[PDB]
Every structure is written in structure tokens, then in C-alpha cells.
């Protein structure tokens, strides 16, 4: 048998040797571009972190109610963020709680109407603007005293609904004695939070620090998981972010947190990587190693013809 | 949700009117509220809202910094002053906040008489 | 803010065949529409919304496609309860600003 073709594969005894028709395996053609996943379209946080869309960023808006998903892309070195200087506590936790949640309910619980001895509309800052004027975040609250008093906090929930819940509250960590004087009348500081399964308590921290944002100080915040059938407690003397949000878990599924800067197009896509949009038919691929939903296995080389003729 | 609207009224030209949105059946604080105009020779129209949460309002271009647009959270309730004008002032609804489906939930009405 | 012109407002046909409208563009609105029809004497309705897809509770006797920059709503098989008229609407970006068109009819032979 002879023939005649211009390919090329390799072998053990030499790498330059040419060969008939031969089989490619390996895809290295990408679309370049974001597109929905089996329909379902996905969720684009523009320029905003995970801490600035769970807390509510002033300027993130467009994010308060969003329909069923498949994953969250987001851009390195997010401007908007989380504005007044602070933390988290287990911000890593909750980005791998995530991922697994395909589906959000908020939910109103400790109405704005339920405080009647606390203040609750004078609580904004000069470091989360809106519009040229002074906001602060929009999931809780920032509780101050009121006619000169800060009374003891005693309040519950119970998880009624049979889906889950996530609550987040905070706490301040203030900068001198004079700020807290002025905040909340008493010096000494403690905040404590009860469930079937947790147990804390916390205090304060008042010291000197440099200027972040133009802004001397810190807050802190926290989260935890309530199940069907339990109850929450909280009790504060001071220096307290209550809620007023929080979020129902409906659907759990697979997803994938993943940073990126491509822009948005309408398609439809089935195997969406980092940077480029994937539909092909073949078993190994190149461009990136971190994949969402059904996709071809990740190599490094170039070359992954194997050879099926013959010459 | 429903929508029902607070009736009608006839006033003078020049006037204004305060048309309202009442509703019920659940979280009035994240939802998108505008109101559409349909004075007989002049098909459909549109004149603005708001996000209760935000408070603010992006008024219309057409006729610009005409009218003012209010909205309350403690009782489900929106709010519209409008201060040629006898027509009769609907009220709508659209869902989401990233993405725009359709104004689903629709009023039945509410007409104004100015005559002289 | 965009500007929409609609086909000839005056249409007018028998039951048993297609009818089709077409709603147009000025600078730009990618897939951000929508559609009403109003039978005279109640509040609008809902047609096939986002631009191209359908909502629950329209037979599928309607129908229609778009999105780019041509709209179209192919309704085939005139039945004997297609008698209103319809309109468009679009949709800007943050805190959003709105602008709706002028309408067709579609009327009895």
C-alpha cells in the first residue's frame, strides 16, 4: 500500500518522523468569551468581592436580588471591595461553603420596627458614599445610642422554615476611649451569641493604628448555620452590628468561584474555563485547569497526535 | 403580589394628583416600581420610579424634572405627584435586579378628569 | 435616551393565515425588550418576553423571534381572538430609565 498526505507524529525512536493521515487529540481553539451554562445564566460581579455583595456594598446595588445561577466570576483586584477597614473572621470557609450553594432566598428577619430604644438611621460613614453622599452597608445595621442610653440587647430567632439559614453580625473595634464614650456611654464592652451547637464571647479592642481609607479604625465580622427546629441568641452591652438580613438556602449543587476578566456575550456554552468559552468533541485540552461541569482532561504538551495510518 | 390602585378624582388644570400603588404578598423592599401614562392620543408612556431601599428616582428625559416619585416601606405603597393632562395612570411591576424579564404583575387602573 | 418606530399601524387581515409585527432600533438595546398587547377597556398583557423567549400562560399560538437588531413577532394560525393592539418597550442601564413606542393594530377584514 502507498499513498501520499503531509502529516507528522512522533515516537520513541524519533520525533520528526511524517506520517499519513493521522488523529488529533488535543483541542487548542477557544471562544474567548463568558457564556450562559445549559441555559441557566451565570452571575457577573462586575467590579465587587464576595464581602461587599454578602454585606451589601452601597455601590454594588445591582446585585440585591438575583435569579438561580451556575457559577460566580469575579475580577482580580476588585476596586469596589469592602470599604471600611476591617475583616472577615473564616472568609476562606465561607468561599468553599459556596460553590455549593446554587440558589439564594433573602429574607427579612428583626424588622427595622423591632428596635424601639436604638437608633438605627444615623449610623453612615464618609467611607462608603453614595452619590457624593456619606452610606454605610445594607444587610445590617449599625446600632448607636439613642436619648443617652445603649440598654442590654435579648433577642432570639427560630427557624421555623424547614431550609437552612446563614446570619451575619459584626462587631467595632474602636480607636481611642473619647469615640466610644461618644458611641455607646458604657466603657466596658462584651457581646455573646448561643445555639445548640456554638459558644462565644467577645470583646473590644481600642488602640492606635495608621490611616487606611482615611479611616482609623477596624470592624469585625462574623457568620454562622442554623438548622430546622433550633434557635439563635444574641446579648450585647455595646459596640454591636446587628442584622437585619439573611439567606435561605433552597438548592445545592455544583459550582465554582473562578477570577477572570473577560467580558459578557450571549451564547450557549457547556464547558467554561477561566478565560475562554469550550465546545468541542475530543479528549484531552490545554487552555486552563480549572473547569466547571462536564469537561475534557487537562494536560501540558503540545503534540498529542497519535499516528493511525500507516508509512 | 396584587396591585390595586386608589381610584378616580377630577381637579382643575394646573393641579396635581397623588395616584397610588398599594399592594401586598410579600418583600416590598427589592422590587422595581414605575408607572406608565395613557392619555387616549398618546399610545404608551413612561414617567419613572424607584427602589425603596436606595431612595432616590431617575426621572424621565421626555419631560424632564417634571414629576416627583416617592415610595414608603413601612406599608407597600408608592407614590407619584404630577404637577392635555386628562388621562388615565397605570401601575407596574418587574422583577429581578441584573436582568430584565418583563413588568409580569400589572394594575387595572386609574383615570383623572381635568375638563374646565 | 432611544427612540422605537413600529410597522404600519393600520393591518388588517381574515382568520386562517400568519400575521407578523416588527418593532425597530435606534442606537442600541442588545436583549432588553419586551411586549404587551391591550384588548380595549383593561390593563396590558404579556407576550413572549426577554426579547425572544415566552412566559407561562401564552398559548402557543403565538410566537416570535429577534434580538439583534430586526424584531419580530410570528403569530400564525389567525384564531378567532387576536383582536388588540401591541406595543414595545425597552430598558437602559443603572438606576434605568425607560421609553416605550407608539403600537400597531391589527384589526378584521
Known amino acids: 500500500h502507498a499513498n501520499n498526505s503531509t502529516e507528522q507524529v512522533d515516537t520513541i525512536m524519533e520525533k520528526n518522523v511524517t506520517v499519513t493521515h493521522a488523529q488529533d487529540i488535543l483541542e487548542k481553539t477557544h471562544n474567548g468569551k463568558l457564556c450562559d451554562l445549559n441555559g441557566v445564566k451565570p452571575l457577573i460581579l462586575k467590579d465587587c468581592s464576595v464581602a461587599g455583595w454578602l454585606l451589601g456594598n452601597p455601590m454594588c446595588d445591582e446585585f440585591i436580588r438575583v435569579p438561580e445561577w451556575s457559577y460566580i466570576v469575579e475580577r482580580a483586584n476588585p476596586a469596589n471591595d469592602l470599604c471600611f477597614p476591617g475583616s472577615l473572621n473564616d472568609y476562606e470557609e465561607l468561599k468553599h461553603m459556596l460553590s455549593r450553594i446554587n440558589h439564594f432566598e433573602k429574607i427579612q428577619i428583626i424588622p427595622k420596627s423591632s428596635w424601639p430604644n436604638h437608633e438605627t438611621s444615623l449610623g453612615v460613614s464618609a467611607a462608603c458614599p453614595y452619590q457624593g453622599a456619606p452610606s454605610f452597608f445594607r444587610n445590617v445595621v449599625w446600632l448607636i445610642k439613642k436619648n443617652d442610653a445603649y440598654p442590654t440587647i435579648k433577642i432570639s430567632y427560630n427557624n421555623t422554615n424547614r431550609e437552612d439559614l446563614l446570619i451575619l453580625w459584626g462587631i467595632h473595634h474602636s480607636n481611642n476611649a473619647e469615640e466610644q464614650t461618644n458611641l455607646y456611654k458604657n466603657p466596658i464592652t462584651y457581646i455573646s451569641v448561643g445555639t445548640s451547637t456554638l459558644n462565644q464571647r467577645l470583646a473590644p479592642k481600642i488602640a492606635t493604628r495608621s490611616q487606611v481609607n482615611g479611616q482609623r479604625g477596624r470592624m469585625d465580622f462574623f457568620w454562622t448555620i442554623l438548622k430546622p427546629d433550633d434557635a439563635i441568641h444574641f446579648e450585647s452591652n455595646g459596640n454591636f452590628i446587628a442584622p437585619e438580613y439573611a439567606y435561605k438556602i433552597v438548592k445545592k449543587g455544583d459550582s465554582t468561584i473562578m477570577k477572570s476578566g473577560v467580558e459578557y456575550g450571549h451564547c450557549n456554552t457547556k464547558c467554561q474555563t477561566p478565560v475562554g468559552a469550550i465546545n468541542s468533541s475530543m479528549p484531552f485540552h490545554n487552555i486552563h485547569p480549572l473547569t466547571i461541569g462536564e469537561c475534557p482532561k487537562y494536560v501540558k504538551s503540545n503534540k498529542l497526535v497519535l499516528a493511525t495510518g500507516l508509512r | 403580589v396584587q396591585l390595586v390602585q386608589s381610584g378616580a378624582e377630577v381637579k382643575k388644570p394646573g393641579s396635581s394628583v397623588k395616584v397610588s400603588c398599594k399592594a401586598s404578598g410579600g418583600t416590598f423592599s427589592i422590587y422595581t416600581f414605575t408607572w406608565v401614562r395613557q392619555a387616549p392620543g398618546h399610545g404608551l408612556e413612561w414617567m419613572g420610579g424607584?427602589?425603596?431601599?436606595?431612595?432616590?428616582?431617575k426621572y424621565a428625559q421626555k419631560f424632564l424634572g417634571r414629576v416627583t416619585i416617592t415610595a414608603d416601606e413601612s406599608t407597600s405603597t408608592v407614590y407619584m405627584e404630577l404637577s392635555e393632562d386628562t388621562a388615565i395612570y397605570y401601575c407596574?411591576?418587574?422583577?429581578?435586579?441584573?436582568?430584565?424579564?418583563?413588568?409580569?404583575?400589572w394594575g387595572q387602573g386609574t383615570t383623572v378628569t381635568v375638563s374646565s | 435616551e432611544i427612540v422605537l418606530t413600529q410597522s404600519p399601524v393600520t393591518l388588517s387581515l381574515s382568520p386562517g393565515e400568519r400575521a407578523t409585527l416588527s418593532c425597530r432600533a435606534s442606537?442600541?438595546?442588545?436583549?432588553?425588550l419586551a411586549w404587551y398587547q391591550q384588548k380595549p377597556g383593561q390593563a396590558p398583557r404579556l407576550l413572549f418576553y426577554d426579547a425572544s423567549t415566552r412566559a407561562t400562560g401564552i398559548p402557543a399560538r403565538f410566537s416570535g423571534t429577534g434580538s439583534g437588531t430586526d424584531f419580530t413577532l410570528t403569530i400564525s394560525g389567525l384564531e378567532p381572538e387576536d383582536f388588540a393592539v401591541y406595543y414595545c418597550?425597552?430598558?437602559?442601564?443603572?438606576?434605568?430609565?425607560?421609553?416605550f413606542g407608539q403600537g400597531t393594530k391589527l384589526e378584521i377584514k
Open positions: 424607584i427602589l425603596p431601599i436606595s431612595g432616590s428616582a
Open positions: 407596574a411591576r418587574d422583577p429581578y435586579s441584573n436582568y430584565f424579564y418583563g413588568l409580569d404583575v
Open positions: 442606537q442600541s438595546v442588545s436583549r432588553f
Open positions: 418597550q425597552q430598558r437602559s442601564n443603572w438606576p434605568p430609565e425607560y421609553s
